[PDB]
Amino acid sequence: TPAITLESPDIKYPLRLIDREIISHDTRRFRFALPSPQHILGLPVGQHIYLSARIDGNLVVRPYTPISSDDDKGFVDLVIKVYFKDDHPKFPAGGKMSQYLESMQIGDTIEFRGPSGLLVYQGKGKFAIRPDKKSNPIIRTVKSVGMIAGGTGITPMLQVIRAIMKDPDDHTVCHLLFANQTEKDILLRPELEELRNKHSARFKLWYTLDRAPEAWDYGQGFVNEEMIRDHLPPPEEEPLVLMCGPPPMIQYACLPNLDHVGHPTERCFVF
Ligand SMILES: Cc1cc2nc3c(=O)[nH]c(=O)nc-3n(C[C@H](O)[C@H](O)[C@H](O)COP(=O)(O)OP(=O)(O)OC[C@H]3O[C@@H](n4cnc5c(N)ncnc54)[C@H](O)[C@@H]3O)c2cc1C
């Protein structure tokens, strides 16, 4: 039983950045040292951490789901999309936290906190979902899990997929629908397609793209009722639907169409 990094959620833990990996122009894996090589992070599956820093005089807090797990000793890995300044004409200053991460030098610390979130995956189909931070968790056991992700919204889903996938006696089937703007913006694609090759009986993978390339075998356009009926488990299976992506996708593309297909609001969970 290893030592836990996040011992209480009311404490902020400054972790040293020990490595940087450039994945693409705007995507990067950051590795931080846990307090000892024999430490784990202490992050229930289904929950996330918060990074906090004072940037330009404002406290900035942002949630992140690590790519690493409590099976990893000594370190935590986050995969970060960097929103640069002077790139998108509508958002000229870029992203606050993600540019702060990009500017960190090896040996700089940044504050972690957690674990946080209203959902915990308790394993083999059992999800424990609190209706609010003070209410107690309601337990629902499901045969299948629908997953809609947009952008960096994949890491909450990856954490759950890998947690299922590595338990040979977990027969939960995950149906992922993964939306992004263009093909370069599909994050963690090598990983996702590796899980497809090795676990297709429990993992179904589909994509869509706002602006699809000419050679594209998957979805074109925003998530709709047809893709939800086609690439997510049917309501009659009483699945749980997990969601994480930009607020516009949740509000305009997911929630209304899940309702039209027939997914009850209690079985829909927005990270
Ligand atoms: C449960 C959960 C898990 C998450 N996990 C991850 C994770 O693993 N990795 C990760 O990177 N993020 C993750 N996110 C997203 C994260 O919380 C932040 O929203 C993200 O890092 C952007 O924050 P920011 O402060 O850098 O940008 P902000 O200053 O908060 O603004 C970001 C927003 O500004 C706009 N924007 C700014 N610059 C640009 C640009 N150049 N081009 C286009 N739009 C732009 C976009 O609307 C963008 O969404 C997660 C979120 C949640 C809720």
Which residues in 7-40 are b (16+ Cβ under 10 Å) and which e?
eeeeeebebebeeeeeeeebbbebbbbbeeeebb
d(CA 56, CA 78): 23
Pairing of strands 13-22, 27-33: antiparallel
Longest dimension (CA), the chain: 52
Tokens representing 27 are: 């995507």
Which residues in 66-86 are b (16+ Cβ under 10 Å) and which e?
bbbbbeeebbbbbbbebbeee
- Cα 66 off chain centre by: 8
CA distances for 115 relative to 33, 59, 105, 160, angstroms: 17, 19, 26, 15
d(CA 178, CA 157): 10
Alpha-carbon torsion angle 126, 237, 258, 136, nearest 10: -30
Pairing of strands 126-129, 203-209: unpaired
Instruction: Name residues whose C-beta falls within 8 Å of residue 215's C-beta, 6 or more positions apart in sequence.
Output: none
- The three-state (H, E, C) secondary structure of 200-246, written as one string: CCCEEEEEEECCCCCCCCCEECCCCHHHHHHHCCCHHHCCEEEEECC
Rounded distance from Cα 82 to ligand 1 centre (Å): 8
The DSSP string of 74-112 is SEEEEEEE---TTTSTT-TT--HHHHHHHHPPTT-EEEE
Q: Active-site residues: which are they?
A: 48, 64-65, 244
Cis peptide before 35 (omega within 30 of 0): no
Atom 38, ligand 1: which residue's CA is nearest? 94
Do residues 43 and 66 make contact, with C-beta atoms less than 8 angstroms apart? yes
φ, ψ of residue 256 in degrees (nearest 5): -60, -45
| PDB experimental method | X-ray
The DSSP string of 122-162 is EETTEEEE-SSTTSPPEEEE-SEEEEEEEGGGHHHHHHHHH
Atom 35, ligand 1: which residue's CA is nearest? 91
Query: Which residue is associated with the tokens 């889903």?
Result: 157
Residues in contact with ligand 1 by the CB-under-6-Å rule are: 48, 62-65, 78-81, 83-84, 87-88, 91, 94-98, 152, 155-156, 244, 246, 271
Binding-site residues sit at 62-64, 79, 81, 84, 96-98, 155
Rounded distance from Cα 182 to ligand 1 centre (Å): 17
Q: Which of 30, 49, 51, 64 to mutate to test the pocket of ligand 1 (most atoms within 8 A of CB)?
A: 64
Asked whether the CA dihedral 20, 23, 27, 31 is positive or negative, the reply is negative
Rounded distance from Cα 95 to ligand 1 centre (Å): 7
Neighbours of 5 (CB within 10 A): 21
* Residue ranges per structural domain of the chain: 2-116, 117-270
- The three-state (H, E, C) secondary structure of 30-63, written as one string: EEEECCCCCEECCCCCCCEEEEEEEECCEEEEEE
- The atom number, within ligand 1, closest to the CA of 117 reads 1
Residue type, position 190, single letter? P
